[PDB]
Symmetry: C5
Subunit: 152 residues, 5 copies
């Protein structure tokens, strides 16, 4: 529970890793973090798996941004399937942080949205690592990452 892996891409149009890392060190100052950047979405799964199995990461955050196009939705889906499988093969959680450009109305909002979502899931990593009990307290409360919570 002392090590987190953060995998992002060169394809993404927003730097989500910096915000995540800063949030984790904030909650746990001495936590160990390792980063790895790959070209894009479909390169994340094996990078996340290698970190979990070869670098001793207890958990990993996968940061990606599918483009607007339809086929990008397919690539995302394929990438997400890879993430699901990597987790089942290692029995370790991979927090998926994907932000579709279709969600923002502009680049200012897209940048805001991605960083906010990254940071919020960074708290989820924290809770999963040290306060699993908190999440249960919030069970069924309709929490969201990025835009405002929806609530019960």
């Amino acid at each position: 529970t002392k090590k987190v892996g953060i995998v992002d891409t060169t394809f993404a149009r927003v730097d989500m890793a910096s915000i995540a890392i800063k949030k984790l060190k904030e909650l746990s100052p001495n936590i160990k973090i390792i980063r790895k950047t790959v070209p894009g979405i479909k390169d994340l799964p094996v990078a996340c798996k290698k970190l979990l199995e070869e670098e001793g990461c207890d958990i990993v955050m996968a940061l990606g941004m599918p483009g607007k196009a339809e086929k990008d939705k397919v690539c995302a889906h394929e990438a997400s399937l890879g993430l699901m499988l990597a987790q089942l093969m290692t029995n370790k959680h991979i927090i998926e942080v994907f932000v579709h450009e279709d969600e923002a109305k502009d680049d200012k909002e897209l940048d805001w949205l991605a960083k906010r979502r990254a940071e919020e899931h960074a708290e989820n990593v924290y809770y999963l690592l040290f306060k699993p009990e908190y999440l249960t307290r919030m069970a069924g409360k309709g929490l969201r990452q990025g835009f405002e919570d929806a609530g019960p």
Copy 2:
């Protein structure tokens, strides 16, 4: 016997409480363990860890897909993970998903989700102690 119950913070309805209460009702002594994850896609590995690392004989996965057309994709990916976790452990994972699209309002959504959770809680029971009952109800309707 032990049942694992995994739910989420994303869900807008608490389905776990109703399930747990139903199980303890049918079997007062059954041991139950809970684990809450952020959302739908985080359920598979949590269910698997419970089956393999906490001795759960069976697990209930509680989730609530969003309304968007993409949440349908996330749900589908999550369900695939649940299918695989089961095949990899040879243990059942009762999937309890409730799409918001099914209810006409939050009052109905809350009712529907809890009712479905509780009913599948009975299925867990039957699978654990009375597998014969389910056969009696085979293809019934």
Copy 3:
């Protein structure tokens, strides 16, 4: 000698297992059969796998009925994927017997259709177990 596992559901609106079992015992009275009923479609894969690996079944029949919704089509697809994987992980066949309600024009026909399909695949199980040569003779059907 040979054992067949039959897995059905409580969700299905038609009893397809009885017809299948009767057909198998007919073609092979010395056939051993073990049944297991689960709630629905998505619960079939692991039940089929447990039968193949934990109960010594040489082959298994999976009986299910997806509903009409386009969702149900997704659940069916996910269930079928599970069946495909269970087979590859055990190197044993799982004869999938799914009947969508959309295929029948009403209940009478649905009941007929499901039972007829179950029974016909029951023959396929038979052939796969004792007369694999027959199937080859029928390779590529004839229209």
Copy 4:
């Protein structure tokens, strides 16, 4: 010396196996062949895997005919996924030979098309087994049917 497994179905409306087998024995009268017929598309994966792992096949050909209904497209897709997995689990190639009825304008053409495709992939099996170098020579030359 090498062994090739051929798996087809009773669902298919065209016999694609005969043409393939004849083509292989033609190019390699010494290749070893072993056939297995299953009910349909979704029964091919495990049959192909059993041949690769239990019968010593070096490679396998999967012959199937998806139907016209979109439901048939889903089954095909699921079947193809099984074929992909069987290969990754054995580290052996499975040449997928599927022919959708939607491709022909009639049976006359459907029968021709299926047999032609089966036979052409039968050459691919040959090349993969004995002349892997040939395929490289044809890398990116748009081999399909045009």
Copy 5:
């Protein structure tokens, strides 16, 4: 030291392998490389896996071209899933280089686009093998392989 596997197809209407190979040897003269050609898209996964596990490749490039038909889109998707799985099963990266004909307006452009994308991913292979740090420096920059980068 360091071996790159390159797998392409006879189905593809453009030779993407030559450009990739030339780019790698350019960036790493002593880089070792082997090639394997299969019929098409769906034959790539096991070929890539055999190279990673049986020929000692540290990484592999998969070059393919889905055809026009939407049927092709399904085959592509199935092929990509195979690539994702091969990677998770070997803990080695497989750089997917697919080029849909739908992306070009003509063959002149299709040929240009495929070669340019192949070459650019050839640099990604390079970076992944020797300068993983570079990719991190470009994290979130919105880089593309093929058409111009999008940028953050």
